[PDB]
Amino acid sequence: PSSSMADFRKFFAKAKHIVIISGAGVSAESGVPTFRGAGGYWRKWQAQDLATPLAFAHNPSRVWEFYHYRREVMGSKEPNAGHRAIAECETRLGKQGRRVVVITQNIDELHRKAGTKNLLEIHGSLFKTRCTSCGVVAENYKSPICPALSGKGAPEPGTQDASIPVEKLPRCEEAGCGGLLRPHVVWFGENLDPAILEEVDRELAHCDLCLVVGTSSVVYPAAMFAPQVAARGVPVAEFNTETTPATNRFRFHFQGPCGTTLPEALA
């Protein structure tokens, strides 16, 4: 694990297919908290407990409050210099006939807002819904997503659940369905999309340089992506404020906010 930017740049200059894996840390400097420690809580509950099939099945109103809140917070948010460096890198290399692809754990769409085109959102999106009856996935940026959620989603401990009746939670507007919608987001304990996983596999297999940016490397299976490329003999560069369990697997580690390290790295 070197911290030599110059050695990384040598590899960067020659790379024809760069995979950039990102986690919540890439959006921290945008004012979107990660789930590490404090941001991992909402009212009395842990985010990793709310983001489960069990929690939603038994209390879809509380879970929707939680997602509504996040959708609303995400409204004000802007890509940071980390996101911008990544998008600009893709566009510049694209004109050289070189490839950059972003594989993100994040559901916040900030990579998209920054202009990134080659993007695999492996955990879905905060701004998509899926119908729990007919399975139809739709884009949704409505604020609020439904009338009953207005002013709701307050994260403060002791905030009673709005306890919205299920017919007044977001409902499918497909012809003759009316089903309860859920956020189109992969929850803990759910399968990732097999089609997306095969796209991920094709990128990992063909790439020649990999960056792992702002991820804890403890969410599976995404945590195994970069280790797998590094096993193939490919250089992996980690950009994170801390070391992680995967750190010593990687060729490079650059400590600090990725917003301040990425722009120089990717110029």
């Binding site: 992969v186 929850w187 803990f188 304990g189 759910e190 990732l192 403890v218 599976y220 299976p221």
Partner: peptide, 5 residues
């Protein structure tokens, strides 16, 4: 592949 923390 199941999403796990």
């Amino acid at each position: 592949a199941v999403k796990c923390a």
